[PDB]
Amino acid sequence: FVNQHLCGSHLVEALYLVCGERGFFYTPKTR
């Protein structure tokens, strides 16, 4: 692994996959 650029829906998809079966319980929004 090496650190990478991620924006918007790709940053959400990556955080959801790294957070496994948890992720967000609600619909996602940029913050």
């Binding site: 692994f1 650190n3 990478q4 650029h5 991620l6 924006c7 918007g8 940053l11 990556a14 955080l15 959801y16 790294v18 957070c19 948890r22 992720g23 967000f24 940029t30 913050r31």
Partner: peptide, 22 residues
């Protein structure tokens, strides 16, 4: 907030974990 910390600069798996908890 959180999107800029991976979008305008690179981020890690440990940051992608933190963005699920924040």
């Amino acid at each position: 907030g959180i999107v800029e910390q991976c979008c305008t600069s690179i981020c890690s798996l440990y940051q992608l974990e933190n963005y699920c908890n924040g």
